[PDB]
Ligand binder design. Structure first.
Ligand SMILES: Cc1[nH]c(C(=O)Nc2nc3c(N4CCOCC4)cc(C(=O)O)cc3s2)c(Cl)c1Cl
Ligand SMILES: [Ca+2]
Ligand SMILES: [Ca+2]
Length: 206
């Protein structure tokens, strides 16, 4: 019986949705972006960028508070690592978790992490820069300090795993349609979509 991220990599459809028709693939982006939008709603984030790279990887960057980096007392690793590597169980008995189709809503970034062959996390918090890298959800090394900064926020770069997803090709139109909606709802945040494949860029703002 598989638990945790093992369960996710075994049956990714139960979490992210269909892994062949583009549903799950675009859900990966929105699961990351929704965490930034959480920062916007809380009044800490005014800037989100979403970049599609020429290798069909994604970079989401926000100017929110930065994922917490303190050592977690119970796990003995950074809070950020716990958030990245533990399947969140708080939603399991909430109505809003379960979709008619397309997997789960609010699955968490740890599911994005599990289904990415590489995920690079860069946090600006407490005037330091912190970085962690993962592969298929497994940390390569503990979160570590790599510099100083005068700002704060979170950057996630992820490469969808071809062993989970087929037809790995992001759609500007699918992303823009949701981003329009999020921009409408969250008027204090500007959301930049950047497509390095086509050279196209657009800033979405209420
Ligand atoms: C691109 C991107 N951005 C983020 C991102 O900013 N997440 C953040 N989460 C929190 C946070 N948690 C605590 C645990 O319950 C959920 C909220 C607390 C604090 C704080 O108390 O200071 C701040 C933050 S910032 C994520 Cl995740 C991703 Cl992916
Ligand atoms: Ca959420
Ligand atoms: Ca900030």
């Amino acid at each position: 019986v598989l638990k945790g991220l093992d369960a996710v990599r075994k049956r990714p459809g139960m979490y992210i949705g269909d892994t062949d028709d583009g549903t799950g693939l675009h859900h990966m982006v929105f699961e990351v972006v929704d965490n930034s939008i959480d920062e916007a709603l809380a009044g800490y984030c005014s800037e989100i960028s979403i970049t599609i790279h020429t290798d069909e990887s994604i970079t989401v960057r926000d100017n929110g508070r930065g994922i917490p980096v303190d050592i977690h007392k119970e796990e003995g690793v950074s809070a950020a690592e716990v958030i990245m590597t533990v399947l969140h169980a708080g939603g399991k008995f909430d109505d809003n978790t379960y979709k008619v189709s397309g997997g789960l809503h609010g699955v968490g970034v740890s599911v994005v992490n599990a289904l990415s062959h590489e995920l690079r996390l860069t946090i600006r918090r407490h005037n330091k820069v912190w970085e962690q890298v993962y592969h298929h959800g497994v940390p390569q090394f503990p979160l570590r300090e790599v510099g100083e900064t005068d700002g704060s926020g979170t950057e996630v770069h992820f490469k969808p795993s071809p062993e989970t997803f087929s037809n790995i090709h992001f759609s500007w139109d699918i992303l823009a349609k949701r981003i329009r909606e999020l921009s409408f709802l969250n008027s204090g945040v500007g959301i930049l979509l950047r497509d390095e494949r086509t050279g196209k860029e657009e800033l979405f703002k209420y």
